Nucleic acid binder design. Structure first.
Length: 1085
RNA sequence: GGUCUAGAGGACAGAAUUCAACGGGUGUGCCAAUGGCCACUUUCCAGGUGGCAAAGCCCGUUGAGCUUCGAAGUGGCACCAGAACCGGAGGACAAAGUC
DNA sequence: GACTTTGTCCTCCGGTTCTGGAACCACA
DNA sequence: TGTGGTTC
DNA sequence: TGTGGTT
């Protein structure tokens, strides 16, 4: 309900080692205590425990079985009865097991599916289960917080709330379980960890009437917590595994019921390729099974195969596969799958039903995921060094051991923390101590914290660059942490210790005692994806109650109504456009008097959405220039050299194979062609490689196998040892190298926070991995060892780099949404200023379904991980809480393919750079200009500067503006997508206005397209309607309500096919003809 | 100034373009930002493990020397975390088949 | 550079389920 | 504003 | 090319 932030703080423990060893001892104690109680809970559960399987990561084993639990549980219970000196009934094994299980279901209600408060369950039971003289849980004690009906009865009047106390107390079996435990001599069930032989710490002596220390109460809660979430996962894994088995069986008899002979045929296919495979021997059940990844682009290959003869030779089937791959190599599947699907015996899989193989691939995915699906969540006890938990410390006033944050205890910015209870270690004995004050290492992050009230040392103020007035806040709980790397070690040194302090920060809205900001009633956010919907009824009165008054920054959220849409990307991290709700009674702007751009708003005819500004929120490193292009090329020059040098080293290695027909085919590829016509290698290593080739040329055929093979391996060593010194020096220049480093603020940097610099780092990792796992013996597989780490420090740098990019991306978006711009003065040299009125909503694209998937090619999956847009989305929701900024999503399908101003569909284009058209030393054509020149054969045609090149993936969106041939509307693709999201917000856009899935059928005697009813909006418009044709391309609606479905598209602007419903294929080719067909025809002249 | 609208910090193309001493401090990191030496890992490279060492880093003041108008300028940025868990996918190696 | 199949190892990205309390009464 | 057992 | 990203 309130924004919680963690500020991690480092303790200066140099001058006091006795406390550092005490903090470490306290860490081992709290972990031991939590492990003790957690292990107890697992025995009460008396079900199977599963652990991580060694000797193979994947499945799971049974660490401890149910009988093992019950047998060990009873051993503890019987021994406890003896320890408690029980002279009453001992209870049968079954009685004691049932009691323990009852207790367990009270301590972890998630085990049976109920809800549980780890705070109040641990408070309720620790003393009754560990205090010899405890009276809690029963109904005897008069202390405790008053019931809710007693608080009402004294002020706030009762009748129903006193009833709910009794009817909940009736279903409370705590008192009976406790009394049962007592009658069985288990009145203390467990031990108080601190007051037990397990701990060697000389704790402060127990007061009268005390058995439990605050340290034990922390330990016990943290055991309940982990035990609750795990039981929740035990239930979740089992449920999800049940729905998989149901998915498998509900699929075969709902997809290919009458298609049983094809199932038997693809099975023959999958074992055909299984036996005929030269790869590694199969071990998985679904090995060589037909997956969607291998069938990528099978739709195109199948239609092209349909226009062929079943008895035709292979090459016309095969060359029909090569043409589908050449159209785009990224979105293509397996050649060998299509090669075997062209064989006549297997042709029936795609001939009869052209969608059967993709259907059966979904079945195979269900088969594989089921073979790996777990049925239980692994159970892992805490450990002080392997799986650490951290000792908690309540704020001042809390019930645990507390701490105060001491502002400026030792100097201007020399803060301190006073632990009111701690551990001190002197000459090997741990002793509990009071009131230990520990200085904190300097932290500019702490400069955002100011003390609020001297009488209440918990209060604070919270600074933020995007808030004119500091937020009010309070210190919260803290936890003592160490680094994971300084944990598994022991050594003999005096290990940094940190305190992770939770800060609770109150937003300006929260400070006014309102559950939600007043503008939250205008925007409906739905689901976990925060799908944004506008209450068009309510924004007419909101503008009346909240008129724009010009207040900037955080002071303007209660005046005006603005939404900022954001188009995340890789080239530019964020592209935004800001719109303001305003009456259509407006005027001309301050610049040159041009009617402003606006969008109509559904419902209100008096109100429009006026465009305020658009901006490219580039993170540093996302610029480009002649010199920047050069440095980025040079920074990877030697890397790209070594990468191709290694690729030919492996060609040389294959020449020493024991397989005649492998070394001969490999030795051919080395002598047939020159070594480096592209000049991609280094000179000196290439010369060394050429020497070894010409040396082997004077031995090939002349010599014997075991004498030629021996020389090939001896030439690999010379060349590998040579390249080994090159990899050695390259790394020296990467770490120790003296490259220029920016000072102060500077725009236009080499890498910055860009994708390319992170990939510049990633590229180095991949090559080093490839270099270390390079094999001098042909055919051998070299993988990493079962617990190895590779390039630890480089890997940690790559991860930190992505973390910094993520947080700076979200902050840039939020600072812009609030209306702050980082501006330079050179007398101040950069400062956040409030330049614009803020936006109450940040509108992102709905991309939750744009996930990594095996159907996607790996290069597309890789970019999605580089991008990690969902991470950006989650970091936005985090950082927006304090500022009262709503972040929502908009349905994004075709957001980048239709014009935001016009509505007409379009194509993403690039413009020719002047580098390639200048007559004085022209630079080579890029990749996309080459592919375009080749498709239309424009080798003899002179391209001009800024010539539009339709590539389908450029940064410039082009759409037809009218029937005029050539009349284009061009706008930044990302900004056009951003404005499309805005246009969809104010009009309640549904995809059914533009795209429709239909199936053929009979309605009024004629064959028509029956639209699929998906969602209430598609049903509200097209349920009673049906589409007819005269030609098969252009469809028209009626009013009455093959085997594959048909997708109909529509141009809302009426420019393409007069906005009639058109089949998807021909629709996008009409779009192509009016843009690409025109640009090509004009270049040819 | 050329191209393109959204008319904005507009977007594309183009033309243009660091020592020293002393004092204090070194939360997590990033910005061209991936530490150094030794030993071990059978072997040289990569990677890892361990050991050692001084610092390297910022900030301030006083000097120099640079570089633009005697003055100024020799650093900027971001930060909500903890544990466990279930998934989704990358990466590397070998064979084979493909643009 | 891009793409597929086989296995096995290290890594990363996304989401879940717990969490980072409050307050009364007898103490001696 | 104590703690420690106790209830919310 | 055809949801979203962009070699």
């Amino acid at each position: 309900s309130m924004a919680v932030k963690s500020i991690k703080v480092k303790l200066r423990l140099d001058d006091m080692p006795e406390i550092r060893a005490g903090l470490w001892k306290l860490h081992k104690e709290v972990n031991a205590g939590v492990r003790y109680y957690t292990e107890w809970l697992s025995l009460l559960r008396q079900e199977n425990l599963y652990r991580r399987s060694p000797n193979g990561d994947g499945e799971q084993e049974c660490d401890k079985t149910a009988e093992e639990c019950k047998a060990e549980l009873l051993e503890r219970l019987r021994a406890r009865q003896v320890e408690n000196g029980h002279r009453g009934p001992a209870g049968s094994d079954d009685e004691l097991l049932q009691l323990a299980r009852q207790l367990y279901e009270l301590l972890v209600p998630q085990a049976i599916g109920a809800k549980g408060d780890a705070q109040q369950i641990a408070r309720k039971f620790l003393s009754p289960l560990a205090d010899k003289d405890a009276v809690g849980g029963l109904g005897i004690a008069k202390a405790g917080n008053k019931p809710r009906w007693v608080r009402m009865r004294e002020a706030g009047e009762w009748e129903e709330e006193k009833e709910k106390a009794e009817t909940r107390k009736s279903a409370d079996r705590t008192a009976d379980v406790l009394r049962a435990l007592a009658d069985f001599g288990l009145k203390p069930l467990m031990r108080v960890y601190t007051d037990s032989e397990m701990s060697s710490v000389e704790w402060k002596p127990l007061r009268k009437g005390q058995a439990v220390r605050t340290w034990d109460r922390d330990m016990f809660q943290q055991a309940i917590e982990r035990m609750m979430s795990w039981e929740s996962w035990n239930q979740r894994v089992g449920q999800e595994y049940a729905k998989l088995v149901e998915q498998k069986n509900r699929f075969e008899q709902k997809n290919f019921v009458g298609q049983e002979h094809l199932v038997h045929l693809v099975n023959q296919l999958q074992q055909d390729m299984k036996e005929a495979s030269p790869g590694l021997e199969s071990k998985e059940q679904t090995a060589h099974y037909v997956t969607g990844r291998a069938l990528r682009g099978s739709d195109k290959v199948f239609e092209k195969w349909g226009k062929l003869a079943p008895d035709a030779p292979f090459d016309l089937y095969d060359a029909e596969i090569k043409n589908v791959q050449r159209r785009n190599t990224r979105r293509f599947g397996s050649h060998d799958l299509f090669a075997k699907l062209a064989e006549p015996e297997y042709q029936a899989l795609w001939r009869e039903d052209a969608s059967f193989l993709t259907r059966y691939a979904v079945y195979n995915s269900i088969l594989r995921k089921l073979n790996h699906a777990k049925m239980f969540a692994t159970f892992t006890l805490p450990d002080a060094t392997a799986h650490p938990i951290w000792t908690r410390f309540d704020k001042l006033g809390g019930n645990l051991h507390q701490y105060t944050f001491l502002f400026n205890e030792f100097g201007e910015r020399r803060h301190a923390i006073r632990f009111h209870k701690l551990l001190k270690v002197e000459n090997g004995v741990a002793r509990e101590v009071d009131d230990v004050t520990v200085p904190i290492s300097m932290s500019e992050q702490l400069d955002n914290l100011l003390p609020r009230d001297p009488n209440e040392p918990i209060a604070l103020y919270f600074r933020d660059y995007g808030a004119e007035q500091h937020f009010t806040g309070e210190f919260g709980g803290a936890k003592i942490q160490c680094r994971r790397d300084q944990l598994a070690h022991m050594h003999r040194r005096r290990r940094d210790v940190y305190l992770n302090v939770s800060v609770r920060v109150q937003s300006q809205s929260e400070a006014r005692g309102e559950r939600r900001p007043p503008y939250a009633a205008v925007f409906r956010l739905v689901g976990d994806n925060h799908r944004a919907f506008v209450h068009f009824d309510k924004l007419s009165d909101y503008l009346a109650e909240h008129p724009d008054d010009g207040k900037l920054g955080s002071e303007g959220l209660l005046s005006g109504l603005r939404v900022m849409s954001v188009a995340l990307g890789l080239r530019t991290s964020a592209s935004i456009s800001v719109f303001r709700v305003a009456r259509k009674d407006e005027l001309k702007p301050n610049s040159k008097g041009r009617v402003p751009f606006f969008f109509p708003i559904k419902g209100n005819d008096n109100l429009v959405a006026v465009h305020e500004r658009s901006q490219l929120l580039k993170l540093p490193g996302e610029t480009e220039s002649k010199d920047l292009r050069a440095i980025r090329e040079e920074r990877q020059r030697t890397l790209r050299q070594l990468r191709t040098q290694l690729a030919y080293l492996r060609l040389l290695v294959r020449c020493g194979s024991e397989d005649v027909g492998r070394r001969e085919r490999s030795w051919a590829k080395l002598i047939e062609q020159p070594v480096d016509a592209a000049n991609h290698m280094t000179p000196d290593w290439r010369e060394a490689f050429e020497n070894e080739l010409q040396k082997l040329k004077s031995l090939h055929g002349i010599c014997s196998d075991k004498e030629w093979m021996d020389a090939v391996y001896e030439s690999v060593r010379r060349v590998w040892r040579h390249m080994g010194k090159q990899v050695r020096d390259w790394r020296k220049d990467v770490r120790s190298g003296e490259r220029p480093k920016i000072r102060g603020y500077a725009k236009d940097v080499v890498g910055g926070n860009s994708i390319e610099q992170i990939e510049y780092l990633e590229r180095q990792y991949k090559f080093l991995k490839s270099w270390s796992f390079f094999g001098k013996v042909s055919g051998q597989v070299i993988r990493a060892e079962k617990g190895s780490r590779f390039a630890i420090t480089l890997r940690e740098h790559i991860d930190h780099a992505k973390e910094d990019r993520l947080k700076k991306l979200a902050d840039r978006i939020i600072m812009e949404a609030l209306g702050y711009v980082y501006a330079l003065d050179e007398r101040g040299k950069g400062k956040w200023v409030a330049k614009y009125p803020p936006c109450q909503l940040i509108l992102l694209a709905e991309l939750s379904e744009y996930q990594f998937n095996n159907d996607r090619p790996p290069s597309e999956n890789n970019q999605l991980m580089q991008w990690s847009h969902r991470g950006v989305f989650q970091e936005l929701i985090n950082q927006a809480q304090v500022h009262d900024l709503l972040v929502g999503t908009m349905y994004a399908a075709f957001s980048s393919r239709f014009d935001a101003r016009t509505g007409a569909p379009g194509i993403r284009c690039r413009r020719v750079p002047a580098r390639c058209t200048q007559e004085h030393n022209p630079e080579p054509f890029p990749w996309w200009l080459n592919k375009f020149v080749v498709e239309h054969t424009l080798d003899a045609c002179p391209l001009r500067a800024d010539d539009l090149i339709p590539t389908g993936e450029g940064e410039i969106f082009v759409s037809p503006f009218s029937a005029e041939e050539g009349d284009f509307h061009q706008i930044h693709a990302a900004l056009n997508a951003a404005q499309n999201l805005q246009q969809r917000l104010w009009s309640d856009f549904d995809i059914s206005q533009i795209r429709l899935r239909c199936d053929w059928g009979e309605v009024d005697g004629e064959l028509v397209l029956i639209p699929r009813l998906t969602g209430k909006r598609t049903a509200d418009s097209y349920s009673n309607k049906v589409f007819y044709t005269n030609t098969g391309v252009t469809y028209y609606e009626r009013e009455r309500g093959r085997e594959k479905s048909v997708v109909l598209m529509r141009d809302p602007s009426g420019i393409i096919n007069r906005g009639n419903w058109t089949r998807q294929k021909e629709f996008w080719s009409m779009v192509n003809q009016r843009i690409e067909g025109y640009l090509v025809k004009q270049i040819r002249s």
